[PDB]
Amino acid sequence: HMARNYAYPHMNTLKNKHNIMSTKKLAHVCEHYAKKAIINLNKEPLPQKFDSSYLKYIHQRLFESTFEWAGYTRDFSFTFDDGTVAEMPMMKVPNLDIFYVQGNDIQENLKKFDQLLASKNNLQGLSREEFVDEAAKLFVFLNSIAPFRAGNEPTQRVFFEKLAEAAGHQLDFSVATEKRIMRACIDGMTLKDNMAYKEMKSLFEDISDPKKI
C-alpha cells in the first residue's frame, strides 16, 4: 500500500521537489543536478570508511534537489511534505522475474556489505587485478540490494569510482556502454556461483585500464 506514495496520486511519475509531472523531463532535470552535485562532491576528501553511510551521503547529494527522501533507503518509512508515508519493501528487477533484496533484509545486507569492505581494508594494498576481482564481487552484491527507491545505479557507480581512487586504482563507468553494464548486473543476479561475477570482472578490467584514455 505505502509504495504508491513515492509516486503522485494521479500520475506514475515520482514525486519531486520541482513539481515536474513528466517522467522524461524529470530524468533530464535529475541528471542536471546530479552532475552539479558531483562537482562539489569531488572537492571533498575521500572518506576513511567506505560504508553504507557514505553510500547514503552520495545519494543524498545526488538527489537532494529533486527527491525529498534523498539519502533514505526504501526500508525507511519516509514522511513526505504532503503528509503521506512511503516505503517500498518489494522492488522487482525490471523485465525479469526476480526481486531485489526484500525491504526487511536491507539493513542486514548493508551491514554485511560494510563488514566485508572493513575486513578487506577498503580493498587497499592490492594489485589492479586483485582489486578488479574483489571489487566486481562487491558490486554485484550491492547491486542486488538496491537499497534506494531509485537512483541506485549512479549512486553505486560514484561509490565504486571513489573506492577505486582510494585503493590506488581507477574506475570510469562512462568508458563502457550502458547495455554492457546492465548485462553484467543481470549475469550477477542470474548465473550460478562462479559465472555470476565473470562479466562484471571483465567490465571492471576494461574500465580500470588507464589506457581507457
Residue numbers in the entry: 8 to 220
What does the paper behind this entry write?
Proteins containing a FIC domain catalyze AMPylation and other post-translational modifications (PTMs). Among these, Bartonella effector proteins (Beps) comprise a particularly diverse ensemble of FIC domains that subvert various host cellular functions. The FIC fold comprises eight conserved α-helices and encompasses a characteristic active site loop between helices α4 and α5 that forms most of the catalytic center and the substrate binding pocket. Additionally, FIC domains generally contain a β-hairpin between helix α2 and helix α3 that is referred to as the “flap” and mediates docking of a target segment in extended conformation via β-strand augmentation.
BepFIC domains with a glutamate (E159) in position G2 are represented by the B15_Bep8 and B11C_Bep8 structures, which are virtually identical. Although the motif is highly degenerated to PFxxGNE, the fold of the domain and, in particular, of the active loop are canonical. Nevertheless, the binding of a triphosphate-nucleotide appears to be impossible due to the presence of the side-chain in position G2 (compare Figure 9A and Figure 9B). However, simple outward rotation of the glutamate side-chain allows the accommodation of an AMPylated side-chain in a constellation very similar to that of the Tyr-AMP target side-chain in the IbpA/Cdc42 complex. Intriguingly, the model would allow binding of water molecule to the N-terminal end of α5 ready for a nucleophilic attack onto the phosphorous, which is in line with its phosphoester bond with the tyrosine, i.e., it is ready for deAMPylation of the modified side-chain. The strict conservation of a glutamate in G2 may then point to a role in water binding and proton abstraction, i.e., the glutamate would function as general base. About one quarter of BepFIC domains display a glutamate in the G2 position which would clearly interfere with the triphosphate-nucleotide binding mode observed in AMP transferases, i.e., with the γ-phosphate forming a salt-bridge with R2. However, binding of an AMPylated target to members of this group of BepFICs appears possible, which suggests that they might act as deAMPylases with the glutamate in G2 involved in binding and deprotonation of the hydrolytic water. B11C_Bep8 FIC crystals were grown from a solution of 30% (v/v) Jeffamine M-600 and 100 mM HEPES free acid/NaOH, pH 7.0. Data for Bqu_BepC FIC with ADP, Bcl_Bep1 FIC, and B11C_Bep8 FIC were collected at 100 K on a Rayonix MX-225 detector at a wavelength of 0.9786 Å on beamline 21-ID-F at the Advanced Photon Source (APS, Argonne, IL, USA).
